[PDB]
Subunit: 336 residues, 5 copies
């Protein structure tokens, strides 16, 4: 029996290697397999990855006539000491087990150990959508030991920045992913002490032109179309009135449709300001003709009692486009 080469019953595996002395170093490597999904309302993401550990334990040394190592499955894990990593700020996770548990142990003759497993994790990520759709988000995944402080276990990336590998075909449906890198930091708990923590960081961006074409284009077109009425003769009331009222109706339907398809985040975003200012411009163009119609009727009644283009139209033809251009300049300077 191979479990008789390792003196399982001659040693107590409830304590760490080197217990009572200096801390034991443990190295970590990670390979990212895929990004499964992202949730904007719940503010989390899901990832599948390979996790590997490296450490040395003299109690597992065995004699050999050559340099062949021995490989074991998940059944041996319960009989020896292994490091207890967990994912910080996660919501749910599990280890894959088809057709059997995806766990491996490899032991060298001199006592070096490799421990590998395949896991799926959902972790939290705070997001800010004030600048939507020109926003940028940064996310991270954190690893830490649950029960051992830095006095007992020393956690580090095995090969520095070379310890992170990502799949060539990783992609998301509605985001672009870039800038994977690794960092470390020390954390404190008043109950127990200081801990090492490892990080995996990346960035997310959207496709700008899609949102431009879907949202900003129709609003600009409707605002420009409402300016046509300033060039129609003022004597055609049944032509001037329906134009303005139907433009207002169209702008309202567009705004409702746009709201129906965005993530349901209930605070003011950058796209909302643009849409509601355009709605005010279309509203003001209808009141402009109401003032012209009233003053023309007043003059005709006074002339009849005694017995060309109105100035408001001429000034509107200049004022409305200039105001819209000035608003656009300020907006795109603020929001880049």
């Amino acid at each position: 029996k191979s479990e008789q080469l390792l003196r399982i019953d001659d040693h107590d595996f409830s304590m760490r290697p080197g217990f009572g002395g200096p801390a034991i170093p443990v190295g970590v490597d990670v390979q990212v397999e895929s990004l499964d999904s992202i949730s904007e309302v719940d503010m989390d993401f899901t990832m599948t990855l390979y996790l590997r550990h490296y450490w040395k334990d003299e109690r597992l040394s065995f004699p050999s006539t050559n340099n062949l190592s021995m490989t074991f499955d998940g059944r041996l894990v319960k009989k020896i000491w292994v490091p207890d990593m967990f994912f910080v700020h996660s919501k749910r996770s599990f280890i894959h087990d088809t057709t059997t548990d995806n766990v491996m142990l490899r032991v060298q003759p001199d006592g070096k150990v490799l421990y590998s497993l395949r896991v799926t994790v959902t972790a939290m990520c705070n997001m800010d959508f004030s600048r939507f759709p020109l926003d940028t988000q940064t996310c991270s995944l954190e690893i830490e030991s649950y029960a051992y402080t830095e006095d007992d276990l020393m956690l580090y990336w095995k090969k520095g920045n070379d310890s992170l590998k990502t799949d060539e075909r990783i992609s998301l449906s509605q985001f672009l992913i870039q800038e994977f890198h690794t960092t470390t930091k020390l954390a404190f708990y008043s109950s127990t002490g200081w801990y090492n923590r490892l990080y995996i960081n990346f960035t997310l961006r959207r496709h700008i032109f899609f949102f431009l074409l879907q949202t900003y284009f129709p609003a600009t077109l409707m605002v420009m179309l409402s300016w046509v009425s300033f060039w129609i003769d003022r004597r055609a009331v049944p032509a001037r009135v329906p134009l303005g009222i139907t433009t207002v109706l169209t702008m309202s339907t567009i705004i409702t449709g746009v709201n129906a398809s965005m993530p349901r985040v209930s605070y003011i975003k950058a796209v909302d300001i643009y849409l509601w200012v355009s709605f005010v411009f279309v509203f003001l163009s209808v009141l402009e003709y109401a003032a012209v119609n009233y003053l023309t009727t007043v003059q005709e009644r006074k002339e009849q009692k005694l017995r060309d283009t109105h100035a408001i139209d001429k000034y509107s033809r200049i004022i409305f486009p200039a105001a819209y251009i000035l608003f656009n300049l300020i907006y795109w300077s603020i929001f880049s």
Copy 2:
């Protein structure tokens, strides 16, 4: 073997410490890690936290030549006595188990024990939406012992109000969170007796300006736009009629769009009252013109058979805005 220092087999661990005498006190600490989500249709919320227990048991004392403690994982729990806490009014919960069970036990040489675990819980929260979107909600999470009354187990907060800690970056997408504090209260069950219960309280609020801009602004603009027809000549029937009918259509589409985007709660809310009163104001503007046109036709026929502005318009120009302003004053005094 470390389990031989603690005389596990020399004691019965189905009974509480101090059995037959005074109740054993147990202290509790809580650290809130995140708020995962909140559901308005089912009226519940989800939370992840650390739970910690403190107590003393002389049966676990072991000799030591120094003052170092021993740490064990979840495999020891089944061999000793531990407190049986549960969450009152909860719907589902679980303990995280990747890469192993997130359970820890630490024993001092004099017999003091610390018991810590990491858990996610879903709990019920009754809410009232009569004043939507100006409503305020209060929620709480409750802890109690399942099998021991106040005569056997004494449950209390370990450090008073300092025993509750919350994450620096706790947030929700559609709510504002504030005012965490802890309380205690005694509960009675007729079948077994009196129990101590612990509480964690917090408050929720919405972003008012977003809802103002999305809902109250368009309705007011449409109501004011319907008043333009009072200033247009009564002889232009093909201009006066379409304006009113199209304003009614626009108001109806806005109401349908707003209804589709709110949580599906089937009773009358504050925002419903405002919207349907504005729909009546636009409705009454169409009947006013119907009366003006009918009386004009009757007068003209009477004059021709025998062989200026109508008073209704002059009165309407004043009466409609004053009534709308009075309604707004009453509404905003009642709903603040």
Copy 3:
């Protein structure tokens, strides 16, 4: 050891108390903790409750110098006999297990046993929506023994109608709950025999005024608006035609919006009849003006070749409202 006071190994716990003789009575109490959700499409509801059992077994009697009882957790269950209750007509259920299994056993010195557990269950409920939104539903939850007939186990409510308790703040978001009571009935299975079954009954109702305001009010307003054209001069064709066609469009949008927000039940309901009759009334008013315009053109052309209000308008002004009022009287007498 506490399990040595009870002669576990001296008795056979695969058989019921009193085996071979009269049936053993078992009493039941239920405390309803919350109603979690209800689904109209799948016709089921979810509930959380406490379940308690009472019976006597002399094999569990133990000597004592006093009258104190002993409490055990869920680990003792597998070593003794317990009743096997199950929920009839259920779809899924589970027992809570955080931080440990929510199971309790208390044994009296004379052998009386109390068995308590906390459970969540989803159960079916047939619903009929023919009278929506004026419908009323009755539901029940049923309890029965799986393997013992009435000749072996006798099941009853321990304290009659006082055995059911409900929470003071139990509520549903879209329903009103009323009239909790308990009942019993005998059931027959041809393979095994007769069984006792216990029932918990309750009733559900809706908020009528919300549905009235959301659905019946706008349709009535639009129907009344379509009658305005009967008072407009027939010589204004470009005002009479657009009014009718726009009213038809508005009614269609209202009907589509209402259908989009109701439960997706694919058969005719009370509200559907009302909406489509109002649609026909608005449709018939457009044909009315088509007849008036055609006859007027014929009359003028005949007179010119040969070289007031039309009666149809006068009669329509009376007939249409009378017909609508008659329809309303019949409808609301049938559907209350």
Copy 4:
């Protein structure tokens, strides 16, 4: 101990009864409790039922001084031989386990065994939606042995067609259920051989009148409303043009609303043909007036330069209704 009356340790229970000889017959009965849900997009249904097995095993015979049988729970199943049935073409399934496993074994003194359990299963069902909403679907649930061919195990319905029972109040929200019956068939696997398979068959149908009223009625009404313009004076251009364009808008909104409420099946169905032919009829009536108005203006200009009802209208008044009637006759003869 009842498990010592049956000589458990004196027999090998890894081999079937009668091993080495003729196949052992096993009878099956089924009782259907409910139909839980049905998914048209994923093409599956969910069912809850009781499964009962009958067979004889002489090794389980025990002596008795009377004719009583012994009852056991699910704990005995692991110690004897039982048949290994499974559901063919299923997606997921489970056995209910509250308050304990819903499994029963009843053994006669002479060795006859009854094995009963309560199970929930999700099974696939291929559907064809070409004739929606006038389509009919057929579904089945299949039962087979996993590891034994017909040379070892003979599987059959115990009581012919009387072996299937259904609940008196089984129903679905959007379908009607009918025609339950049972069949059998032999199947071949190249790796192992022949197997017996058992079937449960039923039929599903829709409510026709609901779909008629929601879809076919409004489209026909709009098509008939477009014919009104043929009877209006050709000189009323601002009355003729908006009527046609608004009818087109109403029809388009109706089609979009109807599409939004159906299951998302991406190929041509029967209702799509009707709606899009009606849209073409409304489109063609607008071009008809564009032709009449153009020819009228050409004639007037020619006569003025030189110094009644148009035939197109007269012929359209007859042609359009006749073509629509003919289309309806063909459609309802093809789709019944």
Copy 5:
């Protein structure tokens, strides 16, 4: 006992057959039962299948007086050596277990083993939607050993291209499935070495005519309808203006409805280009009449101060259709 024929206790089954020598060959067969679902936003598919393994082990040889084989269930798997296959790039999977584990082991007298199990797996699939709805996707399912490299275990298809069988009734609701075939390829890991990998490939396509009729047809019809105004007398302002503005409103509603019914993928697709170019064509025809009306009013004012068809309409009648046809030719040459 049957397990005493196989010398279980005489062998170490933690090591592979032939340890220390050449690699052991393992053959694989697959039968596909169904395709359960597909998610375009999350980019995965779900499959149910049978997996079979073939290999030889001398340690399981047993003497026999005939040539009959023995069959075992999943309980024997834990006592012998079996291959550890897993699915590469999978998100979740499980093995069916109703009414017991769907696992079979059959052993020949000479030591040949067949190992069969039934599993459901969800695997990722990168998709590209640039050419939607004329896009084509290719998918694969991958099988590999978790712990043994090519120096220990040789993995191959048992019968080449004949090792894959698919159900005759495999189908999807919204896709067509075709071209199943198998391949192999070697993969390298820097940590451990070289592995064999097996592939199963297939292709997906859509129903083109459905999307043509639902999307491209209404947009083309509305573009053609906007050309009618070029043939109407320029002096009918209340007929020309409403036609254009209502055409714009109709096109906008169509675009919103189509966007609401497509998968939520946030980048530009082929259908989006066609729809927004058609919207521009309708927008430009409204400015065309704005120019004609202004130039006519200027001329009449100049002539009055001093005391037929306008050319723009004549040229528009030719230019607009030619440009649309040219755009269609270029678009359909690019996207096939």
